[PDB]
Design a protein around this motif. Structure first.
Motif, PDB file in Angstrom:
ATOM      1  N   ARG A 207      23.345  16.701  70.582  1.00  0.00           N
ATOM      2  CA  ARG A 207      24.699  16.970  71.072  1.00  0.00           C
ATOM      3  C   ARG A 207      25.318  18.204  70.377  1.00  0.00           C
ATOM      4  NH1 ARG A 207      28.322  12.550  70.299  1.00  0.00           N
ATOM      5  NH2 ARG A 207      27.306  12.193  68.281  1.00  0.00           N
ATOM      6  N   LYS A 208      24.486  18.932  69.664  1.00  0.00           N
ATOM      7  CA  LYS A 208      24.920  20.071  68.887  1.00  0.00           C
ATOM      8  C   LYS A 208      24.291  21.329  69.483  1.00  0.00           C
ATOM      9  CE  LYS A 208      26.491  20.256  65.137  1.00  0.00           C
ATOM     10  NZ  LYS A 208      27.844  20.534  64.531  1.00  0.00           N
ATOM     11  N   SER A 209      24.856  22.484  69.134  1.00  0.00           N
ATOM     12  CA  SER A 209      24.187  23.745  69.400  1.00  0.00           C
ATOM     13  C   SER A 209      23.023  23.910  68.404  1.00  0.00           C
ATOM     14  CB  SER A 209      25.171  24.903  69.296  1.00  0.00           C
ATOM     15  OG  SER A 209      25.589  25.071  67.967  1.00  0.00           O
ATOM     16  N   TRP A 210      22.148  24.861  68.674  1.00  0.00           N
ATOM     17  CA  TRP A 210      21.154  25.264  67.676  1.00  0.00           C
ATOM     18  C   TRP A 210      21.876  25.446  66.340  1.00  0.00           C
ATOM     19  CZ3 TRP A 210      16.015  27.115  68.867  1.00  0.00           C
ATOM     20  CH2 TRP A 210      15.346  27.648  67.761  1.00  0.00           C
ATOM     21  N   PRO A 211      21.306  24.970  65.212  1.00  0.00           N
ATOM     22  CA  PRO A 211      19.945  24.425  65.015  1.00  0.00           C
ATOM     23  C   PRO A 211      19.815  22.890  65.131  1.00  0.00           C
ATOM     24  CG  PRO A 211      20.968  24.709  62.898  1.00  0.00           C
ATOM     25  CD  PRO A 211      21.961  25.202  63.911  1.00  0.00           C
ATOM     26  N   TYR A 212      20.623  22.260  65.991  1.00  0.00           N
ATOM     27  CA  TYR A 212      20.473  20.824  66.339  1.00  0.00           C
ATOM     28  C   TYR A 212      20.528  19.908  65.119  1.00  0.00           C
ATOM     29  CZ  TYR A 212      18.796  23.336  70.398  1.00  0.00           C
ATOM     30  OH  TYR A 212      18.701  24.204  71.451  1.00  0.00           O
ATOM     31  N   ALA A 213      21.577  20.087  64.327  1.00  0.00           N
ATOM     32  CA  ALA A 213      21.685  19.441  63.025  1.00  0.00           C
ATOM     33  C   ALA A 213      21.724  17.915  63.110  1.00  0.00           C
ATOM     34  CB  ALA A 213      22.906  19.957  62.295  1.00  0.00           C
ATOM     35  N   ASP A 214      22.221  17.366  64.218  1.00  0.00           N
ATOM     36  CA  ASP A 214      22.286  15.904  64.343  1.00  0.00           C
ATOM     37  C   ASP A 214      20.875  15.305  64.346  1.00  0.00           C
ATOM     38  OD1 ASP A 214      21.916  17.127  66.870  1.00  0.00           O
ATOM     39  OD2 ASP A 214      23.342  15.769  67.894  1.00  0.00           O
ATOM     40  N   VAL A 215      19.992  15.879  65.145  1.00  0.00           N
ATOM     41  CA  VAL A 215      18.634  15.363  65.260  1.00  0.00           C
ATOM     42  C   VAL A 215      17.857  15.757  63.991  1.00  0.00           C
ATOM     43  CG1 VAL A 215      16.493  15.481  66.553  1.00  0.00           C
ATOM     44  CG2 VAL A 215      18.642  15.337  67.780  1.00  0.00           C
ATOM     45  N   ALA A 216      18.190  16.914  63.418  1.00  0.00           N
ATOM     46  CA  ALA A 216      17.542  17.336  62.181  1.00  0.00           C
ATOM     47  C   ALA A 216      17.761  16.320  61.083  1.00  0.00           C
ATOM     48  CB  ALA A 216      18.036  18.699  61.731  1.00  0.00           C
ATOM     49  N   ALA A 217      18.977  15.793  60.988  1.00  0.00           N
ATOM     50  CA  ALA A 217      19.309  14.891  59.887  1.00  0.00           C
ATOM     51  C   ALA A 217      18.356  13.704  59.812  1.00  0.00           C
ATOM     52  CB  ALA A 217      20.743  14.430  59.985  1.00  0.00           C
ATOM     53  N   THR A 257      11.685  23.134  64.209  1.00  0.00           N
ATOM     54  CA  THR A 257      11.448  21.714  64.003  1.00  0.00           C
ATOM     55  C   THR A 257      10.342  21.484  62.986  1.00  0.00           C
ATOM     56  OG1 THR A 257       9.931  21.385  65.858  1.00  0.00           O
ATOM     57  CG2 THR A 257      12.297  21.196  66.313  1.00  0.00           C
ATOM     58  N   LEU A 258       9.367  22.390  62.925  1.00  0.00           N
ATOM     59  CA  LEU A 258       8.361  22.297  61.882  1.00  0.00           C
ATOM     60  C   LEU A 258       9.015  22.513  60.512  1.00  0.00           C
ATOM     61  CD1 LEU A 258       5.505  24.135  63.771  1.00  0.00           C
ATOM     62  CD2 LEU A 258       5.593  21.707  63.231  1.00  0.00           C
ATOM     63  N   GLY A 259      10.094  23.292  60.487  1.00  0.00           N
ATOM     64  CA  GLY A 259      10.869  23.485  59.273  1.00  0.00           C
ATOM     65  C   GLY A 259      11.569  22.246  58.742  1.00  0.00           C
ATOM     66  N   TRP A 260      11.613  21.195  59.543  1.00  0.00           N
ATOM     67  CA  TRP A 260      12.213  19.942  59.124  1.00  0.00           C
ATOM     68  C   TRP A 260      11.219  19.056  58.366  1.00  0.00           C
ATOM     69  CZ3 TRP A 260      14.644  18.644  64.552  1.00  0.00           C
ATOM     70  CH2 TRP A 260      15.699  19.536  64.779  1.00  0.00           C
ATOM     71  N   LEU A 261       9.948  19.457  58.341  1.00  0.00           N
ATOM     72  CA  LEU A 261       8.963  18.725  57.580  1.00  0.00           C
ATOM     73  C   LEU A 261       9.113  19.005  56.091  1.00  0.00           C
ATOM     74  CD1 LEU A 261       5.957  19.483  59.972  1.00  0.00           C
ATOM     75  CD2 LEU A 261       7.387  17.430  59.948  1.00  0.00           C
ATOM     76  N   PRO A 262       8.567  18.115  55.250  1.00  0.00           N
ATOM     77  CA  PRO A 262       8.839  18.268  53.819  1.00  0.00           C
ATOM     78  C   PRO A 262       8.173  19.453  53.119  1.00  0.00           C
ATOM     79  CG  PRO A 262       7.506  16.298  54.237  1.00  0.00           C
ATOM     80  CD  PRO A 262       8.005  16.792  55.571  1.00  0.00           C
ATOM     81  N   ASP A 263       7.012  19.913  53.578  1.00  0.00           N
ATOM     82  CA  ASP A 263       6.323  21.033  52.939  1.00  0.00           C
ATOM     83  C   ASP A 263       5.219  21.578  53.834  1.00  0.00           C
ATOM     84  OD1 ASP A 263       4.201  19.197  52.676  1.00  0.00           O
ATOM     85  OD2 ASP A 263       4.839  18.635  50.649  1.00  0.00           O
TER      86      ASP A 263
END
Length: 284
Positions: A207-217, A257-263
């Motif tokens: 429900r956010k603009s890029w970078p889609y922080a809601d789903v990122a969380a 989205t790959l940037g949301w992975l831990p390492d």
């Protein structure tokens, strides 16, 4: 559709798998019950090969589109035309025999699809029938539903025999709390070891603009918990998008989205080892 651009950075490792896309060939009409074909141009093998070359995708899982309901013809024909690089996720149900399953396996099928949202061919009420056959064939099942109903489905999801993947960041259309019962239930499901979580189609639920922080969380939390259970996909050809103006850049979307992975090790897992395990592919 945009089919070229600057490469993802960092670059994809050899063997990278796109676990989420649809493909369309001429001569395969839409079936009643679904949304109809993508109005055009028909997104086929030629266009997707360009995308593969851009992103550095080496292997693709081609999944049955809602347009084709329970008729697997198009999907199987796409896999055959794509050759060694491609495998199929198709529709099975209680009418599917053992012999049918072997035909599908020989033709490159690695799993079956449940889609509980509008347009889906087989909804969650057929889960047990799909799961019993998938398990018997050592396949996986792709399972897509409105994630905000996870607690209602928990008892049935616990009974799943097969390897399965929870589609499109869970499609938690209203969000979910990172420390609520939903997250607790999801992590417990993952702990058992037969559930993978898909990073594809973020923009279909954010429900956010890029970078889609809601789903990122919540996606960050899940990937940190279980880096050996994340898979990635493009969601090509982005069927929910109708105007050139709103069409995403697939390389940038991948980096995000790959940037949301831990390492970095988790990024390699998400692109290579994890899909190899989910779909039981030969190792690269």
């Amino acid at each position: 559709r945009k089919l070229s651009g600057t490469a993802p950075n960092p670059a994809f490792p050899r063997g990278a798998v796109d676990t989420q896309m649809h493909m369309y060939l001429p001569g395969y009409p839409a079936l009643p019950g679904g949304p109809g074909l993508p109005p055009g141009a028909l997104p086929g093998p030629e266009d997707y090969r360009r995308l593969m070359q851009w992103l550095g995708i080496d292997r693709v899982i081609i999944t049955q589109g809602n347009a084709h309901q329970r008729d697997n013809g198009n999907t199987l024909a796409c896999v055959a035309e794509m050759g060694e690089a491609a495998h199929a996720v198709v529709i099975i149900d209680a009418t599917t025999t053992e012999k049918d399953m072997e035909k599908l396996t020989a033709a490159g099928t690695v799993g079956a699809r449940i889609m509980d949202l509008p347009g889906g061919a087989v909804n969650l009420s057929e889960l047990d029938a799909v799961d019993e056959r998938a398990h018997a064939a050592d396949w996986m099942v792709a399972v897509q539903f409105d994630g905000n109903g996870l607690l209602d489905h928990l008892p049935r999801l616990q009974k799943i025999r097969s390897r399965w993947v929870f589609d499109h960041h869970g499609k938690f259309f209203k969000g979910i709390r990172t420390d609520g019962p939903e997250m607790a239930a999801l992590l417990k499901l993952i702990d058992r070891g037969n559930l993978w979580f898909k990073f594809a189609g973020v923009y279909e639920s954010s429900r956010k603009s890029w970078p889609y922080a809601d789903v990122a969380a919540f996606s960050r939390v899940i990937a940190a918990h279980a880096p050996e259970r994340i898979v990635w996909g493009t969601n090509w050809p982005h069927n929910s998008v109708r105007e050139t103006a709103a069409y995403p850049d697939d390389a940038r979307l991948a980096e995000l989205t790959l940037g949301w992975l831990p390492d970095e090790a988790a990024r390699h897992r998400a692109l290579v080892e994890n899909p190899e395990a989910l779909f039981k592919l030969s190792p690269v």
